[PDB]
């Protein structure tokens, strides 16, 4: 099927740059125009950039028109973002999105959307997160149900990346959205709830991922 | 006052004509602007000719839009060439006398012709 | 640019209920050619890319269920869910795409339903935290409805001010239940200076506040 992968996020000093890539798989990529959309909490969702199919049309955003620079290489099957002068308004979600074909004919919208490539622009520098065990105990039992998790402290920027048994465990878990600490850093915690049956068998290791301080962390977490 | 007309809806790189229409107390000799104003944003002046024909451009239309005038009806032309999409908006005519507008919309849809 | 403004900018219904929201445009999105309305709608799950629901301003994307509904002309445009589902929390965004790309702010639709207890654990700083001269507690508030709820830490029964941040989860998905965490920060030196932590927790649902508690170092 079609996939999109963006990728290239990161922290970047304001006045700095930055180039995103958009990886294209499941389609003919040549044959079909491309675009970046950004996101951000008090942004909305907004249009970045147009590219069609054989680069002879582009378009950009008005508030990036200057500073960004979309670009393809149709053999590579990869998709370009080049930002430069970066500012804090910048600070958002970038998601490359395809364009079908003949929307003029067929009105079809930028329907396949990658997960995203998330960038942070600020002078303050990186902190990988601590990861400490949330372990289950008779203080986080209830009626056969016991509560377990990772507690994700001190990361500077956001995101932090939270899966369970490399993605194998989903269910009942709750990674809550981070908190800012006065220090400057953020925190959180994801959590999960299981048979107080399983504790002695079963094996529950949260995975942290942190790419701006390229922090990768796996931690076992015992009763 | 003063009456535009030519504004219509064209795929990119499309022509359009507006004409704005004066009546009354406008002279020729004050001369002639056409601006342009999309939502949320100030107007702009798009072009503008003087009494003694002397002609000026926006930066953003310098090559692709032109003024000319018919003094003996004191109708005043903006010939509007390779049309982009940020050209979509409401041009009015001013002499100051403002007018009703005419809308310019510029779209940017693919075909397979 | 051709702008889109949505509302309201958010609205809670309970399952079953129907829905509408709505889209303005500043100018007519309808394209001359062929009398086609150039309109979409983008469904935003919690943690998810837009996904997309509708075209042509009426027309169903493909695999898309039957209870959404697109509507309009002129500058005027609605979605409508006719049977809403708890799945269907999420923040629906209008598109133009006839001049140009821009988007509505989007339109947050959340889930009403009956009111549901936490259950209420508590966890002590690990060994690992407390090496580093930190003090973290844990007290987690799981899959209650609705949002309110007061948390109180106390400390050797005293009543703690200024020490904690509380975060809460977006809805769920399948239950439309939140969950809550407050974490109380002391250093190491200041929580080996008292003995008994509890989390007090006040919800709709409790016929009484509940306590979850422990004796540092057991």
């Known amino acids: 099927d079609v996939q999109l992968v963006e990728s290239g996020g990161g922290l970047v000093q304001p006045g700095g740059s930055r180039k995103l890539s958009c990886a294209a798989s499941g389609f003919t990529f040549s044959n079909f125009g491309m675009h970046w959309v950004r996101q951000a909490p008090e942004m909305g969702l907004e249009w970045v950039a147009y590219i069609s199919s054989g680069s002879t049309t582009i378009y950009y955003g008005d508030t990036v028109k200057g500073r960004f620079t979309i670009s393809r290489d149709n053999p590579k099957n990869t998709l370009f973002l080049q930002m430069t002068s970066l500012r804090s308004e910048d600070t958002a979600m970038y998601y490359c999105a395809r364009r079908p074909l003949y929307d003029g004919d067929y009105g079809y919208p930028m329907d396949y959307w990658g997960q995203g490539t998330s960038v942070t622009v600020s002078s303050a520098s990186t902190k990988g997160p601590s990861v400490f065990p949330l372990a289950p105990s008779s203080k986080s039992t209830s009626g056969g149900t016991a509560a377990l998790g990772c507690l994700v402290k001190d990361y500077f920027p956001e995101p932090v990346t939270v899966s369970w048994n490399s993605g194998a465990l989903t269910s009942g878990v709750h990674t809550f959205p981070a908190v800012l600490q006065s220090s400057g850093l953020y925190s959180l915690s994801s959590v999960v709830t299981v048979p107080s049956s399983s504790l002695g068998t079963q094996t529950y290791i949260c995975n942290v991922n942190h790419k701006p301080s390229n922090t990768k962390v796996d931690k076992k977490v015992e009763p | 006052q003063l009456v535009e007309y030519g504004g219509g809806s064209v795929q990119a790189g499309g022509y359009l004509r507006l004409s704005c229409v004066a009546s009354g107390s406008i002279s020729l000799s004050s001369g002639m602007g056409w601006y342009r104003q999309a939502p949320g944003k100030e107007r702009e002046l798009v072009a503008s000719?003087?009494?003694?024909?002397?002609?000026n451009y926006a930066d953003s239309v310098k090559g692709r839009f032109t003024i000319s005038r018919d003094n003996a009806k004191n109708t005043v032309y903006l010939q509007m060439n390779s049309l982009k999409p940020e050209d979509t908006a409401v041009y009015y005519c001013?002499?100051?006398?403002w007018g009703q507008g005419t809308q310019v919309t510029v779209s940017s849809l693919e075909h397979h012709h | 640019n051709i702008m889109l403004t949505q509302s309201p900018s958010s609205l809670a219904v309970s399952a079953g209920e129907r829905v509408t929201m709505s889209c303005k445009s500043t100018q007519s999105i309808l394209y001359n050619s062929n009398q086609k309305t150039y309109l979409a709608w983008y469904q935003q799950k919690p943690g998810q890319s837009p996904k997309l629901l509708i075209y042509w301003a009426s027309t169903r994307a493909s695999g898309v269920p039957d209870r959404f509904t697109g509507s309009g002309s002129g500058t005027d445009f609605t979605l409508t869910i006719n049977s809403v589902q708890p799945e269907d929390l999420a923040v629906y965004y209008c598109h133009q795409y006839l001049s140009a790309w821009t988007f509505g702010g989007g339109t947050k639709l959340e889930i009403k339903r009956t009111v549901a207890a936490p259950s209420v654990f508590i966890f002590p700083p690990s060994d690992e935290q407390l090496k580093s001269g930190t003090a973290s507690v844990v007290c987690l508030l799981n899959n209650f409805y609705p949002r309110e709820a007061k948390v109180q830490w106390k400390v050797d029964n005293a009543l703690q001010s200024g020490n904690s941040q509380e975060s809460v989860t977006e809805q769920d998905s399948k239950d439309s239940t939140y969950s809550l965490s407050s974490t109380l920060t002391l250093s190491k030196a200041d929580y080996e200076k008292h003995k008994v932590y509890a989390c007090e927790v006040t919800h709709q649902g409790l016929s009484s506040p509940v306590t979850k508690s422990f004796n540092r170092g057991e």
């Open positions: 000719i003087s009494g003694g024909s002397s002609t």
């Open positions: 001013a002499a100051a006398y």
